[PDB]
């Protein structure tokens, strides 16, 4: 499975007369734990931002003047939110405590908004000393009329 | 029973209901291995945080000690006290780091730059110099120290 | 070795009367290993891009007309690829699978290119979900005229 | 002590009192056997969710790679990045499934259709083809792939 | 490490012709625990006041008409509070119960405000019988329009 | 791996009707030991010259009139040495004692300067009878105004 791609690139190098390289990495027992720790936190930030895009679009359609697809048959309205973060302004609140691991969640939540059609100019990040100040900082962000969703990352347990 | 994780959840939940905006609340979950990595990372961050903090205090102490300013008293007992304020406003600093073991010493540098900026230090006044190894530090540090527009020099080794 | 550097800075601080400081970061058995993995991955991407720079220069010399060097004063012509990456356009293909360790390779390769005179404007990065779609991504990118080399990084094994 | 089941009960109870409308709140209760069935069901749903998700990314990657569009940068360092947006708007897809073990593969198909629709994919553009077994897939998949109005093809086997 | 400073002061005495002394203290197994107990509480008061200076400055910049430094790249606004307690009025609420240890926190939080550019004339201290009266006493302090942050010290657990 | 090249060249020779020959060399235990020692010495000289190139560029930019190359986003300026030996003049000091070994170090360093864009006219080699004449000999070279770095190799130990 890994040897075939090397052969394909090798044949490509001779065909196009360009230097095309290929390299892999062998992992010991420890780097696998390090790699899995990073991916797990990245997914948690990815899912946290994803749950906010759906809710933001749900409010858009729930208060809309246009009803949509019914149930498996008909005569039963269904409301749900699309995963399209286009034109939505977000706000992220993170705690400085344990910043070596909280920043993984923030990076894993920014690209999720970006890859779903959202531009970085509509993202506002706020950092707080600890988890205790999160509710009172997210309150001030929500006072802004240019915010549609708030994502908060803590560090406990 | 945590008194911290419970109150933060109650506050955010009421915040969303009262303002009618979704507030996605997610926390971390580590089990005996990410905690060790996290504690190792923050230990290095604090190591470079306090290294740049003492330089600010000493730099202000020299300015106040040889300056002409009637200082305050301990409590009003007329015993004047000389101490260094933790306000790096107007101070210019220079950092020397070795790229050997750069995956760790860069956290020391990053944890020292924000310590200067948050205390009022402007970004225009921080100069960073990188060297292949610790054996190159003394000559590089000597060059920065002779400059008149440098109030402190911070160096980080390798281990 | 670590003491003479500290003593030299101590004398320098006393001479100039300013806070010259020096600190060494300790390391337990665990954080030593994570540092060793980081350096290993960084070097792996460093040499990966280093070979591409040499090969790109060699092909540019063969196609060109420059009798630059000779061997020991003899009339024979020895063709060699310099390690100056100025004026070369690169393309990097990386798999997002296990992006924690793969990103170490990507930054190492970019660091090697920029330190050898290369520019950031001439680097093109392509991300793919896995390693099985690298060849289709690579040959689509490699056929572009403004690409002098292509570097591909797969996912981890074992 | 759950921080999730407690806050949801408090919010709904106050919601009914403040609005004077009954809010029947019922949750699930499983003990070591429905949990295994539930986890088995959601594992298949995610299996077909990501299968259709990678097709969207690859389809957009090809369009952007061979297209004439100045792409954005990593952070502003001028290194342009090519990546596939997860917006299946305007893409047309074709799914081939085998009715062998239809009680499981239909969850894969159902978990892939909603993944396309929720990401903006219109329902008019999804075409589903069923075959008696996996041995009929290659010819059926070949017929769909040759169509010009097909941007991706997804197939599900049997086991 | 300790002998060199004594030699340096000794040479200074001969050079300047002034009596310059130097003294150290040797600690047994118990005074080390006593010393560590005092430092640990002093840090807790130091950190508690530090977390209030940052939040007070965060409100100043969050409601400001001037946006500041972006993320590691650009196009993403970041809001954070400087550790400059200049011009900020504070209020401290402490409980008389266990006053032999609560006063350590108060002293460790007053100098933190002082060493960061804050003058003592903007600090208001209020003492209460027990921890139960802290929320209702901090409420009255916050009613004052000349208060920007409230620090509360209890004694339980 | 080793045989695939032979098959590829055979097809290349047939396609162009031109002689193309490939062959490998078999080594016993003794020749393997001596050849890895020679490569080890070459790497040692390569590393020694590489550090000199970087340090020479660092000082050149450190005292340069121009100020640029700021950090990404922030306004702090980073000083670092590029690995481009173009325009730099070097000087190498080697001892005749154990010349069979030192010459590999010298040759392993000359190519490193040349392969990084350094001309051969800027390299100056100086040979001394032994390592005990290096300090004075290196001192004389350093005083020259057309020398940017000095590399010295000692005797075996």
PDB file of N, CA and C in Angstrom, chain F residues 6 9-10 13 18-23:
ATOM      1  N   UNK F   6      19.218  -1.331 -13.328  1.00  0.00           N
ATOM      2  CA  UNK F   6      19.799  -2.032 -14.469  1.00  0.00           C
ATOM      3  C   UNK F   6      18.753  -2.312 -15.541  1.00  0.00           C
ATOM      4  N   UNK F   9      17.932   1.100 -17.365  1.00  0.00           N
ATOM      5  CA  UNK F   9      18.959   1.555 -18.295  1.00  0.00           C
ATOM      6  C   UNK F   9      19.010   0.685 -19.546  1.00  0.00           C
ATOM      7  N   UNK F  10      18.715  -0.611 -19.414  1.00  0.00           N
ATOM      8  CA  UNK F  10      18.706  -1.487 -20.581  1.00  0.00           C
ATOM      9  C   UNK F  10      17.659  -1.046 -21.593  1.00  0.00           C
ATOM     10  N   UNK F  13      18.945   2.160 -23.247  1.00  0.00           N
ATOM     11  CA  UNK F  13      19.950   1.904 -24.274  1.00  0.00           C
ATOM     12  C   UNK F  13      19.309   1.404 -25.562  1.00  0.00           C
ATOM     13  N   UNK F  18      22.234   3.287 -28.107  1.00  0.00           N
ATOM     14  CA  UNK F  18      23.417   3.926 -27.565  1.00  0.00           C
ATOM     15  C   UNK F  18      23.870   3.118 -26.359  1.00  0.00           C
ATOM     16  N   UNK F  19      25.172   2.864 -26.215  1.00  0.00           N
ATOM     17  CA  UNK F  19      25.650   2.044 -25.090  1.00  0.00           C
ATOM     18  C   UNK F  19      25.432   2.753 -23.762  1.00  0.00           C
ATOM     19  N   UNK F  20      24.717   2.087 -22.859  1.00  0.00           N
ATOM     20  CA  UNK F  20      24.531   2.549 -21.488  1.00  0.00           C
ATOM     21  C   UNK F  20      24.824   1.373 -20.570  1.00  0.00           C
ATOM     22  N   UNK F  21      25.782   1.550 -19.664  1.00  0.00           N
ATOM     23  CA  UNK F  21      26.256   0.473 -18.807  1.00  0.00           C
ATOM     24  C   UNK F  21      26.067   0.840 -17.343  1.00  0.00           C
ATOM     25  N   UNK F  22      25.682  -0.149 -16.542  1.00  0.00           N
ATOM     26  CA  UNK F  22      25.530   0.009 -15.104  1.00  0.00           C
ATOM     27  C   UNK F  22      26.230  -1.143 -14.401  1.00  0.00           C
ATOM     28  N   UNK F  23      26.864  -0.845 -13.270  1.00  0.00           N
ATOM     29  CA  UNK F  23      27.539  -1.870 -12.491  1.00  0.00           C
ATOM     30  C   UNK F  23      27.674  -1.394 -11.055  1.00  0.00           C
TER      31      UNK F  23
END
